[PDB]
Every structure is written in structure tokens, then in C-alpha cells.
């Protein structure tokens, strides 16, 4: 699968995989997690989504389980993780409230865990999951910069920050951010005109894409009838054209599909294979949003 | 009519006639676009507005007409045209459905036939008409840049886009984008207090405001009570105290007019008449916003 | 107290004192002014906040009235005023409507009102009190610039601007703006995800809090129970746990609280006495903003 360069440091497939829901399944055994592993890095699938909190802090162990079970397996994926959301499940159960650490022991802690429990001594890529409203961005940038300097983390970057997040944390810290993971999809739409999308695209952040199905709605009547109409086109599921319709954008939005599905992994490329021009993206945004793009103000 | 410069590259009249009604006219005939271009020029209005979508892609040619019949009468003016949106009418009616192009190639296409229509070698001034959820900053960029540097379009700016549309396309280009033509009137007060407004005054950028007499919806009672009595104070119209409330504002605001009726044509210039104090201009913005300007907190 | 340093040239109390109230109280005598200013300094709180606008623009007088028959005690504290609010009252009863100047011209009347009405040479701080839709910020710039040069203002910030509007003042001033006096408590919550704070924050710029306590509103449930268990865990009142979490922030908030009661001023302190971890921090905003924080977007 082709490949993109978040930085000079760090290179992903161009549709990533997301494990939030492999402890959900009924098979958690590693023979089961190496299965999709392999299931994706057969369609060419390299990079691996997950969180500290994922599964209530369980879902890195289980894909460890995976991994320290098959010597090798590791070198062939990226994995990106995230810490900075506590709530009171697992080893933070002692904990009184959901709320955010962005502290430099929590980022620490959290990390130290992730490498622990994934059996590996780096992570590709470092996110901070949200954004605090009590962040102390010196600290939190001193902590994520010495994490880049050890090799422990290869590149940093941030999920669901706003632009003033964003510009916050860059400010504290000497590494360049190399992504904003938030939402994107035909069922959520607001990052392309509200000013997200346009600053990550002025400083050439390539954002990644959570829910980029919108969430399950997508599928459960016009939107749907063109993804299948253009899909039947071009030989490719309704499924394949709405991650196509983000893989069109100029600012190379990496999707984040997740799936426990191994019929999905085996067909997630092909919107790799969708030709989408002007017209038909602004055909299936215009079904989406409901309404016409605003013409000429003189009218 | 006093000037405005927008650069060191360009300068309009401080009012300017906005064209997109000219193919509405019963009387389309070089004739009567001449007599039109010579009622704004008998007021010192040089500047004349259009864009490529005018007409359905016919009012540049319909203003070519009486350009092309008068030698000497594009001399005596500046043209602002736009493109940028592509509707299935005249040229475009191959068109599946409404978008925006900001491509290199439609742009020099609609430029192309910009020039030809009106029958000139160069426009003072290109807007990029809408803010392209599709846009490539980088391509438009350098097309805009190629067109200034050819000498065909003498300055570039924008139209309808918001502060992070304007940064975006403007940290892609080498030269400065010299306006952005948004709506602004007392029906339209956003942009004074949403950072629209703040955003190109830091900048120095000059806005032209469209709809500035609200779009036909100001004449159709307190603001308007107090329109007419200060235009009756100063021997003018309630349209010219409303271009005025516009001309006062520090941000060097360019309206743009747009009527076809030859006597609001003979009266536009009266708004330059009008002397508007700060407790005027916060006396009809709070007539328009319908409450008082927020006062001390502590209270 | 503990100090809080604005700038190299500007230290604050902690907790700054609110004189908006000064002229509400039945005794307006010099005697209880000195009063009022006394028990403050008892608690370590130095730091005084005026505005021109207060009481109808007699407040200052008032507050002089008392420091005009104390002589030593104006070395004793730091004095904040503001200016730019414009309301039919006192000596601008002249005043057609209420309008904001922020004219070279007003500011330095107000600010020599301010001296004379206070019997001072000198105001610590000085705030541009609203945004003014109407602003020129190079005039406004070069007005405030002077006053710093002049000795008379050790130091400017604004009150209630949005990030677009300081950002615009500060580009037209030689000075950095040392503070922005802004709504924030458990039942103002905006600024700390809508921007307003992150900016504030990026800049090393410490806002000033108004209405800390909510303004009345807070002591008028869930959030009321957890004020007063955390009080009665601390030995103090639910008043100081609300000025605590405000005292958290590693923004560096600077609460402003306006009391005429002598036994309110006397506890005022308290608030330093609260440790505030980032799990109680959590608690009462979660109760405040009345729902969970967002927790992982992939669920």
C-alpha cells in the first residue's frame, strides 16, 4: 500500500488500522491478534492505532500478547499509541473522577506501560488523546520532547486538539507535532470550513481520521445511494468510496479504520482504487451536508 | 471621488459598482452598459465588479459589448472579477453538479476568458470568489503568483473566506492577497466582533463589503427612523448614511453598489457627503444589533 | 500574600480587591474607604481594581477621598483602572448613547481623571475596558505606548477581549499588554476550551478573573455540595475552594473579587490555604459543566 511521510522521521501506510475494539472479541488469544495483524499487512496495512485507556487499559496488553508470541512481528508495523485520558477502570481504578494528566510522570507512567505491555522498546508514534483544559504546556512539551531525544517514542503528535491546542503545545516544545487525529467522515464535516482542517493544511500537518464511516450512521439514503452508485462504477463497496472521499483531500487525511472484521481488513484498500474527481467530491459533500455550496453572494 | 489604495499595485474608487445585475437589464446593448460606465465615472466611480458566474457566465461579455464598441473607456477604469465557482450554466452546462475549482487550470481558463469577454489585456484585480473546501493552497498559490507576475491581473485577492481560509492561501504565495469582499452592512454586524474583521485590520488589508445597504431587507424601523433622520440632517438619503456607517469604520472599508437604476447611480457619491461621528456610527450599529453595547462587568 | 509578577515592571497581590461596589455602600466616607483598603493590606491583598465608569464615574473620587486623607497609604498598594466605556452619566452626561472611545484623546482625558480623582501621579495598570468595534489600533496603540513612556501607567492590558482583538491591539503597541480582565469561575467555563485561555496562555499573558464567584449565581446544587465538602476537608469556606480552582490553572489566573463586606474581605486569604489536585480540579468542573469530559473518541 502507498505509504505517506508524517515527517522525515516517521512514515505510515496510508490507512491505519485501529485496535480499540481487540479486546472485544471473543478470541483474545495471541494466534487470533497475529491473524489481524496479518490480515492487514497482507493489503499492505502496516500501522497499528491504539491507546493506553483501550479496553480499560488492557487493549496494548492483549496486542502485546500477540507480538511476544511472534518473534519479528513488531519490526513490520508502526504502532502509534496515546495517553492522557484517566478513567477509573484497570490499573487507574483507584481514581476518583474521569479527567485528563498531561503531567510529565503520567506521560511517563502511561508510556513506560504501552512498551511494557506491547513487548517492544519504542512506539512510533506518541498522541495526547484530548485536550486538557488544566495542561501545563511547558511541562507537557518538556516530557514529550526528552521522550523523542531517548528513542523511546519516534515522533509526537496530539488527537483532537483545536487549533488553539495545537498552537499551544508547538509553542512549549522543540519537535514539530506531526498530526492532529480527529474527526472526519461525510457525516462530520465542520473540520473543512471551521478553520481545523485549514490549520493543519497551513502548517502541513496531515490530520489522521477517527470514525472516517461516520460512526456506524452512514450505513444504517442519498449519500448512501451515490457511495454505492460510484462503488458499483468502479468495482468497489459504498464502504471503500466514503474513505476514498477522504483520501481526495489535498491535506492527505490518513484514515483510522476499526474493524474486528477480517473481510473488512481483506477489502480496506480498495479505496485505494477509487478515482474521485472535483465533481464527484463535491457531489457526495453536498449530499452530506445537506445543501448546495453558497454560490455567488450577488444574486 | 476620492481613492483607496488597496497597494502600492492598485487603487479603486472609494465606492465601487458592482456589475452582477448588468445582463438582468431589459437593455443589454453596448449603448446602455456605456451610459451605465458613464452615469459611475460622472460620480468618480473607476471601479466596476464582476466575476466569471455573473450572468451564468455571460455578464463579463455583456459589459465586453460596450467596452469594445467605446475605445478609451477600459482606461478610465479598474476591473475586479472573481472566479472560483463553477454552476452548470452558459459554458459550465456540462456540469454534473455546483462546486468550487481553484485549480491552476481553471483559473487561467477563467481569467482566459475573462480578458476576452470584456475585451482587455489585464484585470486590476482577481478574486478567488469562495473558499474551496478542496483547496490545494500550494497549486492556487502559485497560479496566482504566475498571473501577477505576467502582468494579466494586476493584484489578488479573495472573497467570502474566513481569517484561517485567508492565512492558508496567503502562506502559499509570495505575493499579498490585497482584499477579501466580504458582507458587511447594519443587517450584517458579525464580522465586527467575530475576528473577520479584527483578522484583516492587523493585516492592513482593506475589506469591500457586498449587500452594504443589507441586501434589500434594511428599506423593506428604528434604523430606519434614524437613517432618514441624519440623512435629513445632512441633505442626503437614508442609502447614503448607511454607505456612510460603512465608509467611517477604521479598517478603510470599499463598498460595492449594486443597482442597474441610473439616479441611485447619480446619488452613490452622497454617502462621501455624510459626516459620522463615533456616537453616530455606535448609534445606528446599536439600532441594527437591536441592544445596547455591553458596559462595565462589574455591575 | 503571595505576589504575582505581570511583567519585570508590574507585581500584583494574588488576589486582587474589586472597588465596583465602593459607591453602592451607605458610608462613602474617607474613614471607611481607609477602612476597606486596610483590611485588605491585613490579608496581604495590596492590589486594587478601579474603572473610570464605576459608581457613574464618581468611584475613583470616592476611593480618592480616602487616599487623599491617608498620606502614605497610596504607596501601599497597586492601583488598576480602565477606560473606554462611554455612558450617559456624571460628567459624560452629554453623551447622546452609550458608545466605547478608545481615542488618544479619551483615554488620556480618563487617565488624567483617574490621577486627579485619586490624588496620584501614577496608575499601576491600565485597561482598555471592552473591545471596541470602532477601534483604530494604531491610535490606540501609540496613545497607550506613551502613557507607559510618560510614567504615568507602569503597564497596559485589556478587559473582555477575544484573542483576534488583542492580537490586533498588541500588533499597533511597542509594549506588551501584561493581562486580559476576563469572566471566568466554575459557572463561566468557556474560555478555558473555546480558545480565549489557550491563547492567553501561549503568550505567558496572566488573565484577571471577574466575577470569580459566579456573580451570585453559585451560592443561589451538585457543585454547591462539593464547594462546602471540600471546605469542611480544609477548614474553610466554599467562597475560597471556588477561588481555588481558579487559583490552579497554570494560566495563572488573578481573581478580582468585589465584596463591600469587611468579614469577606478578612477571609479573602483562605483561598491559598486550598490544595486543589488535579482529580478535585476535575470534580468540580465535570459538576459545573453538569457532564462527563469527553473520553475516547473510539468507543
Known sequence: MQRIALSDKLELSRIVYGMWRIGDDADTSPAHVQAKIEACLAQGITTMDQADIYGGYTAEAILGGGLKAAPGLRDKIEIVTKCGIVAPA??????????????????????????????????????????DPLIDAEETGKALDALVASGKVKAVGVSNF??????????????????????????????????????????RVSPMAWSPLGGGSLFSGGTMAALQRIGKEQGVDATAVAIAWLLRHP????????????????????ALR??????????????????????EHHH
Open 90 to 131: 484497570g490499573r487507574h481504578s483507584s481514581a476518583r473522577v474521569k479527567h485528563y494528566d498531561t503531567t510529565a510522570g503520567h506521560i511517563n507512567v502511561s508510556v513506560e506501560a504501552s512498551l511494557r505491555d506491547m513487548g517492544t522498546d519504542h512506539v512510533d508514534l506518541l498522541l495526547i488523546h484530548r485536550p
Open 162 to 203: 483545536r487549533p488553539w491546542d495545537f498552537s499551544l503545545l508547538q509553542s512549549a516544545m522543540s519537535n514539530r507535532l506531526v498530526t492532529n487525529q480527529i474527526e472526519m467522515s461525510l457525516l462530520a464535516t465542520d473540520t473543512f470550513t471551521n478553520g481545523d482542517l485549514a490549520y493543519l493544511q497551513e502548517k
Open 251 to 270: 491535506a492527505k487525511i490518513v484514515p483510522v479504520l476499526g474493524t474486528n472484521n477480517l473481510e473488512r481488513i481483506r477489502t480496506a484498500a480498495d
Open 274 to 295: 477509487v478515482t474521485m474527481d472535483r465533481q464527484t467530491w463535491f457531489e457526495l459533500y453536498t449530499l452530506a451536508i445537506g445543501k448546495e455550496v453558497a454560490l
